């Protein structure tokens, strides 16, 4: 069912998997944008 | 009678079970109290044996499982088939075999990632294979990228057709009991279905595919105007332009004029001088042979026709003088425990594949090949390896036969009460022996240390002074290479070149094989082996046989398989489980494996490999020190790991630095593993007190309260760890010495 | 009743309950133990009957084209062996109007609507005659017996009526002309792969001189 | 409102027991179970009946400037390419100006789902407000000046099953003629009269 596969979907590896993959998407893209980067420049 | 059972919808499928995890287990249905629980989730997950006590829940689940690995195997052949088409450069290879090195994996340009792109040739930049897929797929008759395409999208259905079988015969159709143990029928079957027919497929597929595909590629003809594979079936003249005895088609084969075919069904020997492999002829009569002697093999058995040997009658019918018939009752023992065919089977895999990893250096079946040097070493590596661990396995698997299955109130066998009868006197005579060998292989290594440094090489054990000559083995060698001619006198050639009859095979200016000289250094190393295997043999027999009682616990096998210790008294009990001997086992295989492949290593770099010039005149790698140095324990440190380190520690700044980045992080997980092995575990509950205490100060202490491991998950993650450590450090010093040198 | 290799244990299932039955079961694969999937006896013989009469046709219509063109009635042009019709393009293609894949989507449609509407009537019998089918629905419901439909539709003329031994006998034709197709697609699939030449043409070399036989047609040329 | 006796997506089959022929366009499909919760019932009417406004709305905009540029009427250039070219201003201001002001409608149409009936007042002058009754089916002078909204539950059912079986054709139709101008590589127009030209060979099969 709808709330089984919920629930499913809401155990501590799956939810894992899911939030490291996020953010290892949002590191490795940002990382294409600004690269090489020693220090903080903006200000 | 041989009937095809079963039950219809046994189980029904929903997705409740997902939620509940710890749904097979009646103690862990009920949610976690500590963090243990967890860790206990995963470590019983596929022991079924131990979800109930019925046999034909057992199998169905068992049958289930296995679709499940088929499938899953099937995604790793589809998936390397498919980045062969898509990202390598075989068909440039298929052009320049000896120049150019094999590559399948390209990486994205990220982080400064790039460099592992190396220049390998073709106008193509990757990363170097050594599973020597492009040497399988040459001598299969692939020419295109299109071909493996569609060798990749078939091995996706067939991976989803093993899961769709896999969930129809566990949840809708499954087999009853009875349908397992027929096995004589589903002996008949492999033997004979699988097998046989099988050889029989493949043996034609050689016949109409392979050779006339390699006559064009050994002839110097471009990959794309060769004739396609279909074209050598629908035009039979094409084919006769060849091999000319396709005109009277298989008139032959029936009329028993089979010489008509000794042109493509060879009894050769020997090697290609072109490629440096196995005649294909010859790995087709080969396939043929075998075919008939399994397909005669699977007729052994009765099934439903009154006709073919009993196994219950075999076994019974041979009994023994020894006052009874030591081999009744072995029947009923291997149709109804799981795990003690399990052991058998582990057994004789591991055992089949050491044999494998043996002959295949020695007689390399692939073209292009032997010169390969990498790959050739992965290979011998890898399977000495996995035939390791399955050997280790089968023991591991005894005794659980032993401590859950065993009981001879109800199935007695006589054979195994009289070897469990004398424990005592197999167990000291297999010490002594050990002891025996020890001191005189080992010291012998000790003493010419000692002579060395003590300025008398006079008094070493060596050639050019007290000699210790293998004259078995040389006697051996010299019946093998005078073969062909008298006992053998239908055979061309001896069946290696390594046996003797001194003649060399040359690929591009590099060696393939040659005669193989055995010495005093040869002598000392065998004998170092021995040794280690016998100890091996001692301490995973001593688990074995001693799983269930002993002088010291009466009780044994009241405390199970698996279980720490039974307390400090009695002087101290730790370790005394079989589960523990396994443990000790893992390491004394390491050890044992660890110095077949560095024998292997050092003799073929110093006395096979290297490079002839245009007058034959050949200089090896190492230029042949094996001989003088290596029967000092100075001379394996100095002129081995010493010398040949160089290329992996020099490898950072080239396509070669991640292997030593592997190299250096396998170091440190296998220092790792020790802080576990060292150490025990009230020590960590002690800390781990502390550490509560400061997340209770904050109000952030969990539920779930943290626990230190187990005693027997701290020796399990201690020696997985250690074993990971060590084979991919060695893992990288092989791979960047052979690919840099080689 | 000519029992035929009748083994001890299919004698037990096999009592002359259905049409044509003479107990050649040599395996046991129709035992009523242990069912499930496929192997069942009403699938076991549904399949067999549907096998049969898809063959009756089929080998039916790959004889009229080569010995109606024969006898001087088709073009020569159309006039060809079965397997050089566009079913197998190594073997030779013709030019229909649309395309030898459009046309299989085409008939796929067609044939697709038929078998899955067919199907149902399998699991639950007289389900088809609910739901409106441009006013075909009253007539497409069924007998009972998936195998034998019936009705206006299947049955325009009574020719099952009024009798009872009669539509016995005629399941008995039935199975007999349906087995004998099986065996003649089978063999004109070899003979075509055996000779390479059309099955009617192949009729008159054994006929007038019946010395080309099958040892001289054992080389197995291309 | 249950009606058993209605046709199905698939004759002979059981209907789901959370389908009961109450909402139009109902015909029993629903077989990977996504609205087996009554909770998530609503969601889905809500998403599928806006997603068929915005592709009716997509493909009425989409084949008739074509057709007249065929034709000859209209010189409007290729709707594939038309994102590409060059206006008055920015392409990338034209973005934000649309966020904002299709933003403030969603945010407004967003509060009448949790809360129905609580959006239906001008905030402005608060005399001038919304007829409607029923989520999803506004009604006024704004969204209804001629008023067919307001029927028996007869003719009210027929037209809306009738704009939901609209929008699903519009829905596949637009999805087809993206398909159809990244693969054959010229406008939606021309495919219709290269079909009807060799009805044979003019297929996707061609490429
Ligand atoms: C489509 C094939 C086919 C099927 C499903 C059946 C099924 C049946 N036959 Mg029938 N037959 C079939 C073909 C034929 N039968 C016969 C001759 C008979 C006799 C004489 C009898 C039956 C009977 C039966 C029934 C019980 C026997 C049994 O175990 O069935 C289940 C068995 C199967 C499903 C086996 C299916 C095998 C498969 C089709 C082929 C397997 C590989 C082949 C060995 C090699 C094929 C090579 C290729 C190149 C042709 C059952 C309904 C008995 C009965 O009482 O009938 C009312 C009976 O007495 N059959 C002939 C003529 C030679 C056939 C020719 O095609
Ligand atoms: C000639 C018939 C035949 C063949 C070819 C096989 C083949 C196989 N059996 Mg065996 N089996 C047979 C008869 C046969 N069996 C009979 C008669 C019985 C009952 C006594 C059994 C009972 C049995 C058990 C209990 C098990 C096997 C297993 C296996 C697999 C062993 C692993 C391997 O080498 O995979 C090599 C892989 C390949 C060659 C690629 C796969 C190719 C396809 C899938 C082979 C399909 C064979 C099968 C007979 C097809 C039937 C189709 C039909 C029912 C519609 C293998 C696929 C083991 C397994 O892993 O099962 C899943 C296993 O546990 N068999
Ligand atoms: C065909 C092979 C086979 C099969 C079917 C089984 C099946 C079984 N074995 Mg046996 N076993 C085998 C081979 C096999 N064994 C071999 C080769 C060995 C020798 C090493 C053993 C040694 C062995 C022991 C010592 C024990 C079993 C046990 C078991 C049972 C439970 C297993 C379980 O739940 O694991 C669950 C699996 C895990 C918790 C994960 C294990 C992961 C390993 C340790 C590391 C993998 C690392 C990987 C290669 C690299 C990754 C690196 C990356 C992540 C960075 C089960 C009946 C246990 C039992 O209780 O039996 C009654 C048991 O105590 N087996
Ligand atoms: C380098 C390390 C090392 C060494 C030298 C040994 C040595 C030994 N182990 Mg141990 N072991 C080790 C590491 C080592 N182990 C590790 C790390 C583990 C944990 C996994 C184990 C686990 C283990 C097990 C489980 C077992 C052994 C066994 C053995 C014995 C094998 C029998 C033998 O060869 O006797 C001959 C003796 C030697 C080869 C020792 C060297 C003798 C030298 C060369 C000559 C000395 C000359 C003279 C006497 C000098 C006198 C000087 C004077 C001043 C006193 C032996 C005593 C097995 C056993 O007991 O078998 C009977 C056994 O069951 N070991
Ligand atoms: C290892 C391979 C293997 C083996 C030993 C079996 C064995 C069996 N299968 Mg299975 N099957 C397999 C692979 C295998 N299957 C695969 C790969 C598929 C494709 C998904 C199927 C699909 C399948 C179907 C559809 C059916 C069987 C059935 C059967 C049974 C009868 C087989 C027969 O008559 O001969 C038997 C238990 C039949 C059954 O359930 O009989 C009760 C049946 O109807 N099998
Ligand atoms: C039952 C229908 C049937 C009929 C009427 C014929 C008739 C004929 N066949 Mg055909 N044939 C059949 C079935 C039939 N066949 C079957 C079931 C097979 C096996 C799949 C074959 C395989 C076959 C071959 C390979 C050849 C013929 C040929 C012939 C011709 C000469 C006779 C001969 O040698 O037969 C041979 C028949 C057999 C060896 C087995 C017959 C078995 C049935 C049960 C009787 C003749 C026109 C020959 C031809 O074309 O000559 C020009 C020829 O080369 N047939
Ligand atoms: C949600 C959508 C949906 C889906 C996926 C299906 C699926 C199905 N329906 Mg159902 N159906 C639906 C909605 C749906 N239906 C609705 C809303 C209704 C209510 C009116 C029905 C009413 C209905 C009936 C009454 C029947 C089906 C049937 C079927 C089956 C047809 C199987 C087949 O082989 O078709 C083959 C068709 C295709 C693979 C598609 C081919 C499309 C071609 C290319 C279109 C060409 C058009 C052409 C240009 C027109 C002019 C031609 C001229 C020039 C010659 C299939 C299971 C039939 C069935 O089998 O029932 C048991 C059936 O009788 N459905
Ligand atoms: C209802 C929408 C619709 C319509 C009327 C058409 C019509 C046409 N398409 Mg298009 N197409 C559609 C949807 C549609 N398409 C969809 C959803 C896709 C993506 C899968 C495509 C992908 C596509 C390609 C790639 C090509 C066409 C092409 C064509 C033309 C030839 C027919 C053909 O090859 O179809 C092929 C059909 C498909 C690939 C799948 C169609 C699936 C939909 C759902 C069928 C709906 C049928 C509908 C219910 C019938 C009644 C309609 C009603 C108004 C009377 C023809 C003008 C070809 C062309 O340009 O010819 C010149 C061509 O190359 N179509
Ligand atoms: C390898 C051959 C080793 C010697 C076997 C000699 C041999 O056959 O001995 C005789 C006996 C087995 O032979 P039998 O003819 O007595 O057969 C008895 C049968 O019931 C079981 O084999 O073996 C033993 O008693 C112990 C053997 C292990 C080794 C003991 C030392
Ligand atoms: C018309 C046309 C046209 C165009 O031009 C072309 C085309 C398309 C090609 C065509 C078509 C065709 C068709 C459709 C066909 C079909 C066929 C079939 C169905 C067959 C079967 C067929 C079938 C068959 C043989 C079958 C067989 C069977 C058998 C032997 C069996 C046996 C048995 C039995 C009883 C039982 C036991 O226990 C076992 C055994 C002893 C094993
Ligand atoms: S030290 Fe550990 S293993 Fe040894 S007896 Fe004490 S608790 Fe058991």
Same mark, same amino acid.
């Given at each position: 069912?709808?709330?089984?596969?919920?629930?499913?979907?809401?155990?501590?590896?799956?939810?894992?998997?899911?939030?490291?993959?996020?953010?290892?998407?949002?590191?490795?893209?940002?990382?294409?944008?600004?690269?090489?980067?020693?220090?903080?420049?903006?200000? | 009678?041989?009937?095809?059972?079963?039950?219809?919808?046994?189980?029904?499928?929903?997705?409740?079970?997902?939620?509940?995890?710890?749904?097979?287990?009646?103690?862990?249905?009920?949610?976690?109290?500590?963090?243990?629980?967890?860790?206990?989730?995963?470590?019983?997950?596929?022991?079924?044996?131990?979800?109930?006590?019925?046999?034909?829940?057992?199998?169905?689940?068992?049958?289930?499982?296995?679709?499940?690995?088929?499938?899953?195997?099937?995604?790793? +052949?589809?998936?390397?088939?498919?980045?062969?088409?898509?990202?390598?450069?075989?068909?440039?290879?298929?052009?320049?075999?000896?120049?150019?090195?094999?590559?399948?994996?390209?990486?994205?340009?990220?982080?400064?990632?790039?460099?592992?792109?190396?220049?390998?040739?073709?106008?193509?930049?990757?990363?170097?294979? $050594?599973?020597?897929?492009?040497?399988?797929?040459?001598?299969?008759?692939?020419?295109?990228?299109?071909?493996?395409?569609?060798?990749?999208?078939?091995?996706?259905?067939?991976?989803?057709?093993?899961?769709?079988?896999?969930?129809?015969?566990?949840?809708?159709?499954?087999?009853?009991?009875?349908?397992?143990?027929?096995?004589?029928?589903?002996?008949?079957?492999?033997?004979?279905?699988?097998?046989?027919?099988?050889?029989?497929?493949?043996?034609?597929?050689?016949?109409?595919?392979?050779?006339?595909?390699?006559?064009?590629?050994?002839?110097?003809?471009?990959?794309?105007?060769?004739?396609?594979?279909?074209?050598?079936?629908?035009?039979?003249?094409?084919?006769?332009?060849?091999?000319?005895?396709?005109?009277?088609?298989?008139?032959?084969?029936?009329?028993?004029?089979?010489?008509?075919?000794?042109?493509?069904?060879?009894?050769?020997?020997?090697?290609?001088?072109?490629?440096?492999?196995?005649?294909?002829?010859?790995?087709?009569?080969?396939?043929?042979?075998?075919?008939?002697?399994?397909?005669?093999?699977?007729?052994?058995?009765?099934?439903?026709?009154?006709?073919?040997?009993?196994?219950?009658?075999?076994?019974?019918?041979?009994?023994?003088?020894?006052?009874?018939?030591?081999?009744?009752?072995?029947?009923?023992?291997?149709?109804?425990?799981?795990?003690?065919?399990?052991?058998?089977?582990?057994?004789?895999?591991?055992?089949?594949?050491?044999?494998?990893?043996?002959?295949?250096?020695?007689?390399?079946?692939?073209?292009?090949?032997?010169?390969?040097?990498?790959?050739?070493?992965?290979?011998?590596?890898?399977?000495?390896?996995?035939?390791?661990?399955?050997?280790?396995?089968?023991?591991?698997?005894?005794?659980?036969?032993?401590?859950?299955?065993?009981?001879?109130?109800?199935?007695?066998?006589?054979? +195994?009460?009289?070897?469990?009868?004398?424990?005592?006197?197999?167990?000291?005579?297999?010490?002594?022996?050990?002891?025996?060998?020890?001191?005189?292989?080992?010291?012998?290594?000790?003493?010419?240390?000692?002579?060395?440094?003590?300025?008398?090489?006079?008094?070493?054990?060596?050639?050019?002074?007290?000699?210790?000559?293998?004259?078995?083995?040389?006697?051996?060698?010299?019946?093998?290479?005078?073969?062909?001619?008298?006992?053998?006198?239908?055979?061309? $050639?001896?069946?290696?070149?390594?046996?003797?009859?001194?003649?060399?095979?040359?690929?591009?200016?590099?060696?393939?094989?040659?005669?193989?000289?055995?010495?005093?250094?040869?002598?000392?190393?065998?004998?170092?082996?021995?040794?280690?295997?016998?100890?091996?043999?001692?301490?995973?027999?001593?688990?074995?046989?001693?799983?269930?009682?002993?002088?010291?616990?009466?009780?044994?096998?009241?405390?199970?398989?698996?279980?720490?210790?039974?307390?400090?008294?009695?002087?101290?009990?730790?370790?005394?489980?079989?589960?523990?001997?396994?443990?000790?086992?893992?390491?004394?295989?390491?050890?044992?494996?660890?110095?077949?492949?560095?024998?292997?290593?050092?003799?073929?770099?110093?006395?096979?490999?290297?490079?002839?010039?245009?007058?034959?005149?050949?200089?090896?790698?190492?230029?042949?020190?094996?001989?003088?140095?290596?029967?000092?324990?100075?001379?394996?440190?100095?002129?081995?790991?010493?010398?040949?380190?160089?290329?992996?520690?020099?490898?950072?700044?080239?396509?070669?630095?991640?292997?030593?980045?592997?190299?250096?992080?396998?170091?440190?997980?296998?220092?790792?593993?020790?802080?576990?092995?060292?150490?025990?575990?009230?020590?960590?509950?002690?800390?781990?007190?502390?550490?509560?205490?400061?997340?209770?100060?904050?109000?952030?202490?969990?539920?779930?309260?943290?626990?230190?491991?187990?005693?027997?998950?701290?020796?399990?993650?201690?020696?997985?760890?250690?074993?990971?450590?060590?084979?991919?450090?060695?893992?990288?010093?092989? +791979?960047?010495?052979?690919?840099?040198?080689? | 009743?000519?029992?035929?290799?009748?083994?001890?244990?299919?004698?037990?299932?096999?009592?002359?309950?259905?049409?044509?039955?003479?107990?050649?079961?040599? /395996?046991?694969?129709?035992?009523? #133990?242990?069912?499930?999937?496929?192997?069942?006896?009403?699938?076991?013989?549904?399949? #067999?009957?549907?096998?049969?009469?898809?063959?009756?046709?089929?080998?039916?219509?790959?004889?009229?084209? #080569?010995? /109606?063109?024969?006898?001087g009635l088709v073009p020569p042009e159309t006039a060809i062996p079965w397997f050089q019709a566009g079913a197998i393009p190594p073997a030779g293609t013709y030019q229909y109007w649309a395309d030898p894949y459009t046309l299989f989507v085409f008939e796929m449609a067609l044939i697709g609507f038929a078998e899955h509407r067919r199907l149902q009537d399998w699991y639950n019998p007289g389900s088809m005659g609910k739901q409106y089918f441009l006013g075909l629905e009253k007539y497409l419901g069924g007998s009972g017996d998936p195998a034998y439909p019936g009705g206006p539709i299947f049955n325009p003329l009574g020719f099952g009526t009024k009798s009872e031994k009669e539509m016995k006998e005629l399941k008995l034709k039935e199975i007999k002309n349906g087995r004998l197709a099986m065996l003649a697609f089978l063999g004109m699939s070899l003979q075509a792969i055996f000779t390479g030449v059309g099955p009617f043409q192949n009729l008159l070399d054994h006929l007038s001189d019946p010395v080309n036989n099958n040892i001289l047609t054992s080389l197995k040329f291309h | 409102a249950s009606a058993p006796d209605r046709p199905i997506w698939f004759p002979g089959s059981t209907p789901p027991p959370w389908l009961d022929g109450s909402l139009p366009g109902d015909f029993g499909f629903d077989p990977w179970g996504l609205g087996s919760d009554p909770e998530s019932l609503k969601w889905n009417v809500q998403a599928e009946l806006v997603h068929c406004r915005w592709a009716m709305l997509g493909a009425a905009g989409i084949f008739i400037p074509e057709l007249l540029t065929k034709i000859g009427i209209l010189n409007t250039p290729s709707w594939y390419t038309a994102g590409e070219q060059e206006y008055f201003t920015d392409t990338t201001?034209?973005?934000?100006?649309?966020?904002?002001?299709?933003?403030?409608?969603?945010?407004?149409?967003?509060?009448?789902?949790?809360?129905?009936?609580?959006?239906?007042?001008?905030?402005?002058?608060?005399?001038?407000?919304?007829?409607?009754?029923?989520?999803?089916?506004?009604?006024?002078?704004?969204?209804?000046?001629?008023?067919?909204?307001?029927?028996?539950?007869?003719?009210?059912?027929?037209?809306?099953?009738?704009?939901?079986?609209?929008?699903?054709?519009?829905?596949?139709?637009?999805?087809?003629?993206?398909?159809?101008?990244?693969?054959?590589?010229?406008?939606?127009?021309?495919?219709?009269?290269?079909?009807?030209?060799?009805?044979?060979?003019?297929?996707?099969?061609?490429?």
């Open positions: 069912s709808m709330r089984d596969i919920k629930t499913y979907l809401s155990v501590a590896p799956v939810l894992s998997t899911l939030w490291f993959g996020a953010l290892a998407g949002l590191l490795i893209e940002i990382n294409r944008l600004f690269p090489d980067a020693l220090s903080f420049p903006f200000f | 009678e041989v009937k095809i059972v079963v039950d219809r919808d046994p189980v029904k499928t929903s997705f409740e079970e997902w939620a509940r995890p710890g749904h097979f287990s009646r103690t862990l249905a009920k949610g976690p109290d500590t963090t243990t629980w967890i860790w206990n989730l995963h470590a019983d997950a596929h022991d079924f044996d131990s979800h109930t006590g019925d046999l034909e829940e057992i199998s169905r689940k068992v049958f289930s499982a296995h679709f499940g690995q088929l499938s899953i195997i099937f995604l790793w +052949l589809s998936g390397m088939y498919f980045h062969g088409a898509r990202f390598s450069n075989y068909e440039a290879w298929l052009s320049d075999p000896t120049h150019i090195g094999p590559s399948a994996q390209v990486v994205w340009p990220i982080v400064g990632q790039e460099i592992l792109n190396g220049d390998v040739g073709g106008g193509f930049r990757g990363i170097q294979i $050594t599973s020597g897929f492009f040497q399988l797929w040459r001598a299969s008759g692939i020419t295109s990228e299109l071909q493996l395409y569609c060798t990749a999208i078939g091995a996706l259905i067939f991976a989803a057709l093993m899961l769709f079988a896999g969930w129809f015969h566990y949840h809708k159709a499954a087999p009853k009991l009875a349908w397992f143990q027929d096995v004589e029928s589903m002996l008949n079957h492999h033997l004979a279905g699988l097998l046989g027919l099988g050889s029989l497929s493949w043996a034609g597929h050689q016949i109409h595919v392979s050779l006339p595909i390699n006559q064009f590629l050994d002839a110097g003809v471009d990959p794309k105007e060769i004739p396609l594979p279909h074209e050598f079936i629908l035009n039979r003249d094409l084919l006769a332009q060849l091999y000319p005895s396709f005109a009277e088609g298989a008139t032959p084969f029936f009329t028993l004029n089979w010489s008509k075919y000794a042109e493509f069904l060879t009894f050769r020997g020997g090697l290609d001088p072109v490629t440096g492999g196995l005649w294909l002829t010859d790995i087709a009569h080969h396939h043929l042979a075998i075919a008939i002697l399994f397909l005669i093999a699977g007729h052994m058995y009765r099934t439903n026709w009154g006709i073919g040997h009993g196994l219950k009658d075999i076994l019974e019918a041979h009994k023994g003088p020894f006052t009874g018939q030591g081999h009744k009752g072995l029947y009923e023992i291997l149709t109804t425990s799981w795990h003690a065919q399990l052991s058998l089977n582990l057994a004789m895999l591991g055992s089949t594949t050491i044999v494998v990893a043996h002959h295949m250096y020695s007689m390399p079946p692939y073209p292009y090949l032997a010169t390969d040097y990498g790959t050739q070493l992965s290979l011998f590596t890898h399977h000495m390896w996995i035939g390791g661990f399955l050997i280790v396995g089968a023991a591991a698997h005894a005794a659980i036969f032993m401590v859950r299955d065993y009981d001879p109130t109800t199935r007695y066998n006589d054979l +195994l009460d009289r070897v469990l009868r004398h424990r005592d006197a197999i167990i000291s005579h297999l010490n002594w022996v050990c002891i025996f060998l020890g001191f005189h292989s080992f010291g012998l290594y000790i003493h010419n240390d000692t002579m060395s440094a003590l300025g008398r090489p006079q008094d070493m054990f060596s050639d050019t002074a007290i000699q210790l000559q293998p004259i078995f083995a040389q006697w051996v060698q010299n019946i093998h290479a005078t073969a062909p001619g008298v006992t053998a006198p239908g055979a061309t $050639t001896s069946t290696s070149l390594t046996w003797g009859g001194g003649e060399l095979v040359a690929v591009g200016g590099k060696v393939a094989l040659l005669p193989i000289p055995l010495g005093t250094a040869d002598f000392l190393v065998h004998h170092i082996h021995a040794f280690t295997i016998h100890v091996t043999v001692l301490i995973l027999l001593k688990g074995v046989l001693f799983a269930r009682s002993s002088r010291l616990i009466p009780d044994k096998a009241n405390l199970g398989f698996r279980f720490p210790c039974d307390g400090p008294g009695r002087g101290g009990t730790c370790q005394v489980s079989a589960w523990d001997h396994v443990f000790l086992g893992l390491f004394w295989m390491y050890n044992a494996i660890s110095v077949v492949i560095f024998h292997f290593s050092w003799k073929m770099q110093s006395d096979v490999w290297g490079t002839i010039s245009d007058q034959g005149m050949v200089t090896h790698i190492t230029g042949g020190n094996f001989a003088q140095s290596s029967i000092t324990i100075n001379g394996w440190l100095r002129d081995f790991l010493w010398a040949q380190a160089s290329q992996v520690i020099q490898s950072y700044g080239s396509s070669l630095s991640a292997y030593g980045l592997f190299f250096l992080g396998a170091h440190f997980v296998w220092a790792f593993s020790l802080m576990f092995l060292f150490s025990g575990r009230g020590y960590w509950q002690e800390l781990i007190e502390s550490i509560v205490w400061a997340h209770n100060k904050l109000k952030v202490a969990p539920a779930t309260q943290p626990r230190a491991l187990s005693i027997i998950q701290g020796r399990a993650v201690g020696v997985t760890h250690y074993l990971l450590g060590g084979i991919a450090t060695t893992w990288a010093f092989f +791979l960047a010495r052979i690919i840099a040198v080689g | 009743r000519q029992l035929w290799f009748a083994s001890k244990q299919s004698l037990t299932y096999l009592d002359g309950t259905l049409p044509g039955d003479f107990g050649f079961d040599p /395996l046991g694969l129709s035992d009523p #133990e242990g069912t499930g999937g496929f192997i069942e006896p009403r699938w076991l013989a549904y399949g #067999e009957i549907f096998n049969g009469r898809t063959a009756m046709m089929g080998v039916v219509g790959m004889i009229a084209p #080569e010995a /109606l063109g024969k006898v | 201001t034209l973005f934000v100006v649309e966020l904002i002001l299709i933003g403030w409608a969603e945010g407004r149409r967003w509060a009448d789902i949790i809360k129905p009936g609580s959006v239906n007042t001008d905030p402005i002058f608060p005399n001038n407000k919304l007829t409607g009754t029923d989520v999803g089916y506004p009604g006024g002078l704004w969204f209804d000046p001629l008023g067919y909204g307001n029927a028996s539950p007869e003719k009210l059912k027929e037209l809306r099953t009738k704009e939901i079986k609209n929008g699903r054709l519009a829905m596949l139709a637009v999805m087809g003629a993206w398909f159809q101008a990244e693969y054959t590589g010229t406008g939606p127009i021309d495919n219709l009269f290269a079909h009807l030209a060799d009805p044979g060979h003019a297929t996707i099969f061609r490429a």
